[PDB]
Amino acid sequence: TKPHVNVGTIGHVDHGKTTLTAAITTVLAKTYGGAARAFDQIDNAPEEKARGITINTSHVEYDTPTRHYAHVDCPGHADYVKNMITGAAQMDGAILVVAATDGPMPQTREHILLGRQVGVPYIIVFLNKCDMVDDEELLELVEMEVRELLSQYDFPGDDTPIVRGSALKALEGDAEWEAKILELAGFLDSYIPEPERAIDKPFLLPIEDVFSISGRGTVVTGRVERGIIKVGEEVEIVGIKETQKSTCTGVEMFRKLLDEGRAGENVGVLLRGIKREEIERGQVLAKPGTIKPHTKFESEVYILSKDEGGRHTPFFKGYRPQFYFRTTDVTGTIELPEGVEMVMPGDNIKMVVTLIHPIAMDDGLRFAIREGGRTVGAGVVAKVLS
Ligand SMILES: Nc1nc2c(ncn2[C@@H]2O[C@H](COP(=O)(O)OP(=O)(O)NP(=O)(O)O)[C@@H](O)[C@H]2O)c(=O)[nH]1
Ligand SMILES: [Mg+2]
């Protein structure tokens, strides 16, 4: 029906993320239609399991006249860390809530830093609790601090929309403050571009199985994550070993012979001139010249706590685990940040990884850290190096 956009509230503790989320749903429901959500319903977030990783997240939905929004709000800072690193709640844009009574605080910086690291494309600021501060000069000083903090982490602070509002007064029904919620939702519509749909990105298929079919020939199976593969087009096989070119001579779903495979479909792709022995676990099919294989990358990782089923023992610089990319494990070595010699369960750090086999990757690729086939961490590629 309507374009779908994924957003969420970030910001320091008690600056009003949950109150803002309730205010958005309530004001939009009475203005444009929809269902309002109360503060208690959003604050009492359910527990979800992405892949051994426990995250507490509330998911609300609301509509502007032209868009439908999926909005995440979390009760704990650790929940935001896990969500942004695992991508369990992906964000086309984030609402940074900064309380005017405090200005930017340590978690304001940390959430902006995580945003840049995991690739949050756009940030909108809601300067909250303005019902408490009447000083115009003080509000201007805080906005300048927020803009410089955003620019410090490469966001466009000078062009960042900043709305001076009161989430509480808007939730309580003050029309003068509800108008600021509508101004915020207006920036959601106008500042966050419509996200690029997967079918319009370069073709990519992670290979999950391989078969020799009748009359020689090789078929690889998997879900088309991005783009379209058409019969006759050339493909590259990227990862694990030297990149090979091949031609797609067929696509099929079950018993149906298709002339193309589209994003989201589970297909089998027939490859010409490729034998079964030339396909390795962890490889992908890709449009030629759109993704490259790499061994070394900078990442942000979360280490599972003991209570989450992770490891009980801390690890040190010689830690040599497996990195699960899409379909398979690849062993790698790590470099810890300067001044960090021990990493506890439950910690999150920047980590430079060197794999023993290249993996087709770019910034934003998610991965799991595993020991003996059991997930002990999750990461995101922040910057490829090799
Ligand atoms: N005066 C005033 N108080 C507000 C406003 N918005 C939120 N508050 C108050 O500030 C407190 C924190 O609200 P909350 O939404 O829970 O903040 P939070 O950032 O979600 N907290 P947490 O980080 O724990 O999830 C509450 O007492 C709330 O009523 C506002 O615009 N004005
Ligand atoms: Mg909250």
- Give ion ligand 2 contacts, CB < 5 A: 17-18
Residues 265 and 371 in one domain: no
Whether residues 228 and 302 share a domain: the answer is no
Question: Are the beta carbons of 19 and 126 closer than 8 angstroms?
Answer: no
**Helix intervals (H) in 204-313:** none
Q: Contact 206/280 with Cβ under 8 angstroms?
A: no
284 and 309 share a domain?
A: no
Report the largest interatomic distance among the alpha carbons of the chain, rounded to a whole angstrom: 80
What CA–CA distances, in Å, run from 289 to 61, 113, 239, 264, 384?
38, 31, 13, 22, 16
Render 324-346 in DSSP notation, one character per residue. Answer: EETTEEEEEEEEPPTT---B-TT
Query: What's the CA dihedral at 339, 344, 350, 354 to 10 degrees?
Result: 100
Same domain, 255 and 208: yes
Q: Is 167 in the pocket of ligand 1 (CB under 6 A)?
A: yes
Do 294 and 239 contact (CB within 8 A), yes or no?
no
d(CA 161, CA 166): 16
- Identify whether residues 143 and 72 lie together within a single domain: yes
How was this one solved? Answer: X-ray
Q: Which of 166, 195, 224 is the last residue of a domain?
A: 195
CATH at 102: 3.40.50.300
Q: Is 132 in the pocket of ligand 1 (CB under 6 A)?
A: yes
Judgement on whether residues 280 and 318 belong to the same structural domain of the protein? no
- Does residue 164 line the site of ligand 1, with CB under 6 A? no
Smallest CA-to-CA distance from 20 within 99, 86, 93 is with: 99
Chain breaks after residues in the chain, where C lies over 2.5 Å from next N: none
| Number of the ligand closest to the Cα of 20 | 1
* 15 is known to lie in a ligand binding site: yes
User: How far apart (Å, rounded) are the C-alpha atoms in residues 131 and 97?
Assistant: 15
Name the nearest CA neighbour of 303 among 340, 339, 338, 328.
Answer: 340
**Structural contact between residues 126 and 97, judged by C-beta atoms closer than 8 angstroms:** yes
Q: Is 71 a known active-site residue?
A: no
To the query of whether residue 17 is one of the catalytic residues in this protein, the response is yes
Do 153 and 163 sit in the same domain of this protein?
Answer: yes
Q: Which residue do the tokens 């993320």 mark? A: 17
Which domain does 137 fall in, by range? 1-195
Q: Does ligand 1 lie within 6 Å of residue 17's CB atom?
A: yes
Q: Are residues 214 and 342 in the same domain?
A: no
Determine the Cα–Cα distance for residues 344 and 305; give it in Å rounded to an integer: 8
Catalytic site residue 230?
no
Domain boundary among 172, 195, 218: 195
Domain boundary among 292, 316, 341: 292
Look up residue 34 and give its DSSP letter.
-
In units of Å, what resolution does this entry have? Answer: 2.5
Cβ atoms of 174 and 166 within 8 Å: the answer is: yes
Cα dist from 286 to 43, 76, 292, whole Å: 42, 38, 9
281-310 b/e with 16+ CB inside 10 Å = b? bbbbbbbeebbbbbbbbbbbbbbbbeebeb
CA angle 31, 75, 312 (to 5 degrees): 155
Q: Within 13 Å, how many C-alpha atoms sit on residue 345's CB side?
A: 13
Same domain, 155 and 178: yes
Output phi, psi for 18, to 5 deg: -70, -40
User: 18: helix, coil or strand?
Assistant: helix
Token output for 321: 């685990």
Q: Is 71 assigned a ligand-binding role in the annotation?
A: no
Q: What is the CATH number of the domain that holds 276?
A: 2.40.30.10
How many distinct structural domains can be found in the chain?
A: 3
| CA–CA separation, 288 and 71 (whole Å) | 36
Q: How far apart, in whole angstroms, are the C-alpha atoms of residue 95 and residue 112?
A: 11
Residues 179 and 217 in one domain: no
Q: CA angle at residue 123 from 120 to 127, to 5 degrees? A: 145
Active-site residue identified among 4, 59, 68, 77: 77
